[PDB]
Amino acid sequence: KIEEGKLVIWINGDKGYNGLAEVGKKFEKDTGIKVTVEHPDKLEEKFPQVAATGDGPDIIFWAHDRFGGYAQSGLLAEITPAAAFQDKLYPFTWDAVRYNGKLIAYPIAVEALSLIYNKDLLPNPPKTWEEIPALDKELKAKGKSALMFNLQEPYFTWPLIAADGGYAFKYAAGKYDIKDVGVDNAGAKAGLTFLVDLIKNKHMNADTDYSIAEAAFNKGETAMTINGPWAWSNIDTSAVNYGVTVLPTFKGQPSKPFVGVLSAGINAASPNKELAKEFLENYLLTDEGLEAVNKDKPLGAVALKSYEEELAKDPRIAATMENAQKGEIMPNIPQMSAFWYAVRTAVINAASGRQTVDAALAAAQTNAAAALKDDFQEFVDLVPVDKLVNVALQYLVSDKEFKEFFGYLQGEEFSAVWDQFFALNEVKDVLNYLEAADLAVYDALNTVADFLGLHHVKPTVHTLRTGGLTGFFDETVALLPLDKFEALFEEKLKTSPEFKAFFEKLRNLDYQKFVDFHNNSKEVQGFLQKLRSYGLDVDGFFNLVAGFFGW
Numbered sequence: 329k330i331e332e333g334k335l336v337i338w339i340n341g342d343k344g345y346n347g348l349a350e351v352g353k354k355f356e357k358d359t360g361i362k363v364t365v366e367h368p369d370k371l372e373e374k375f376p377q378v379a380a381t382g383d384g385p386d387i388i389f390w391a392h393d394r395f396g397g398y399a400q401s402g403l404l405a406e407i408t409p410a411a412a413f414q415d416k417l418y419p420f421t422w423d424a425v426r427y428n429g430k431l432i433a434y435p436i437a438v439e440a441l442s443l444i445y446n447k448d449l450l451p452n453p454p455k456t457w458e459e460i461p462a463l464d465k466e467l468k469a470k471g472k473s474a475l476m477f478n479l480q481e482p483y484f485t486w487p488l489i490a491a492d493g494g495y496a497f498k499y500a501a502g503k504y505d506i507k508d509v510g511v512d513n514a515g516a517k518a519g520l521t522f523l524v525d526l527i528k529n530k531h532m533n534a535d536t537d538y539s540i541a542e543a544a545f546n547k548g549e550t551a552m553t554i555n556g557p558w559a560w561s562n563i564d565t566s567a568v569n570y571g572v573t574v575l576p577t578f579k580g581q582p583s584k585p586f587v588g589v590l591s592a593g594i595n596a597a598s599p600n601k602e603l604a605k606e607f608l609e610n611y612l613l614t615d616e617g618l619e620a621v622n623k624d625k626p627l628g629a630v631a632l633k634s635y636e637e638e639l640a641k642d643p644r645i646a647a648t649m650e651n652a653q654k655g656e657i658m659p660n661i662p663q664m665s666a667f668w669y670a671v672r673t674a675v676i677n678a679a680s681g682r683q684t685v686d687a688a689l690a691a692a693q694t695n696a697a698a699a700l701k702d703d704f705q706e707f708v709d710l711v712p713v714d715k716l717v718n719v720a721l722q723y724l725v726s727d728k729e730f731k732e733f734f735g736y737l738q739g740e741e742f743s744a745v746w747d748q749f750f751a752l753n754e755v756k757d758v759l760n761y762l763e764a765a766d767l768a769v770y771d772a773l774n775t776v777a778d779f780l781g782l783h784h785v786k787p788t789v790h791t792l793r794t795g796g797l798t799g800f801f802d803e804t805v806a807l808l809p810l811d812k813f814e815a816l817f818e819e820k821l822k823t824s825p826e827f828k829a830f831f832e833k834l835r836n837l838d839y840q841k842f843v844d845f846h847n848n849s850k851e852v853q854g855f856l857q858k859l860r861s862y863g864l865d866v867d868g869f870f871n872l873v874a875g876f877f878g879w
């Protein structure tokens with residue numbers, strides 16, 4: 329569990345975590361409370377992993393786009409500043425961290441990518457993407473290259489993809505339409521095609537990552553890079569005389585970076601929420617606190633009005649805000665995780681040659697729009713439903729044990745198990761949730777009820793060999809591609825927020841109420857006894873199920 333009486337903070341290792349630790353030093357000087365600042369890798373994935381178990385940091389720093397999913401998963405405490413504090417930060421930064429009407433983090437700073445260029449190699453940087461191929465030819469004749477930036481993270485390639493028409497989710501009169509994705513329209517294809525052709529023509533290398541591009545630019549090997557304000561400090565340390573300016577245009581349109589608001593959330597499981605609010609409001613989000621972080625690694629245009637009025641005089645910040653104004657604030661909706669994962673795969677596969685731009689973006693378009701109903705269909709698609717029903721039909725008319733038990737299912741005892749199971753408020757909750765997700769679960773269960781109510785079957789010739797109730801389950805499980813299920817299950821938790829959210833709804837279900845249902849109902853107990861009496865390990869089933877959901 330989270331340790332009480334201290335603060336543990338997670339922030340990405342490219343940010344000013346040493347400056348943040350200096351703020352932690354002042355907090356301890358004043359209060360006696362110790363602050364630990366960590367910067368683990370894959371922070372945006374590590375936090376929901378550990379926080380879901382009730383563990384993790386008291387405070388989590390990341391761009392705001394990830395926080396709606398965290399909040400939906402119940403990982404974040406509501407943020408309720410007093411009026412005077414709220415007024416100290418720009419309204420549009422509070423907007424970035426508002427989800428379902430509640431504030432779910434403190435906004436810190438506005439981040440936008442810019443074009444960073446070597447003034448000595450390139451006194452006049454290009455205004456267009458289209459002229460960069462020729463510039464690289466010219467620079468290649470001098471032992472240099474034109475442009476290197478991180479091609480492993482779609483954050484860096486999105487501004488080009490969006491320039492001539494690409495978009496994540498369509499925004500209209502208030503809301504984002506998570507069914508209207510814009511990653512495979514003509515503008516998106518054109519932008520990614522231009523990136524891939526830069527690689528095909530050897531103006532960039534598909535394996536270039538953050539560290540490679542940073543080293544190349546700061547050691548004077550490449551004339552340009554694309555990065556955010558956090559990167560300026562290392563460039564300062566280098567010998568490079570650099571400028572920060574507007575991103576290049578594509579087809580006459582501005583590059584459109586997805587703008588992030590670095591935000592600080594409080595772990596819902598933290599026993600230190602009051603200390604975290606004091607640290608964030610009265611130590612970090614002050615002129616002195618943000619200056620400490622900013623002098624370590626620049627934050628960008630900070631959310632704090634008083635200090636942004638100083639930083640705004642910096643031409644590098646002017647360029648950051650110019651690029652931000654030409655881009656768009658990221659959504660914070662949970663579906664952003666699907667979007668980023670889909671475009672990540674598309675860019676890497678297209679840049680590697682593994683796929684064409686058209687095929688990679690076509691797959692990303694469908695993946696970014698993933699919905700629970702679509703995910704469920706992929707599981708059904710794996711199941712031979714024709715065969716499963718025939719086994720059930722053969723057993724229903726041919727197998728002695730199956731008939732015995734099917735007959736039991738038509739008595740009062742099971743009728744009461746059935747009516748009482750589906751009267752539980754915990755079960756009705758799941759059914760309505762599925763109906764909200766456009767899965768006709770009531771219709772499906774009433775199809776099962778109509779079948780359990782069967783009194784006559786069409787004539788058929790019986791099968792000669794059946795193996796009782798255990799033989800029925802062995803024969804039907806044998807038709808289930810169980811490895812593919814567990815694989816598909818693992819991918820969907822990564823590619824589909826709605827699938828994860830449904831699993832979380834079951835995981836976080838009040839499992840006790842079901843044990844109450846069992847331990848207090850004689851009809852339920854009998855039902856379970858009968859199953860065991862036919863050789864069916866019901867206990868090994870429930871226990872295995874409880875493990876699946878962590879009950």
Ligand SMILES: OC[C@H]1O[C@H](O[C@H]2[C@H](O)[C@@H](O)[C@@H](O)O[C@@H]2CO)[C@H](O)[C@@H](O)[C@@H]1O
Pocket residue numbers: 340342372391392393394439481482483484588668
């Ligand atoms: O590349 C996808 C990734 O983009 C953004 O992450 C940024 C982050 O916002 C910046 O602060 C900086 O650290 O670079 C990261 C990209 O490497 C999204 O915020 C993130 O959720 C998304 O996965």
Ligand SMILES: [Cl-]
Pocket residue numbers: 478480481537538539
């Ligand atoms: Cl990287």
Ligand SMILES: [Cl-]
Pocket residue numbers: 766767768769
């Ligand atoms: Cl359906």
Ligand code: NA
Pocket residue numbers: 408409410
């Ligand atoms: Na307060």
Ligand code: NA
Pocket residue numbers: 517518521685
């Ligand atoms: Na094309």
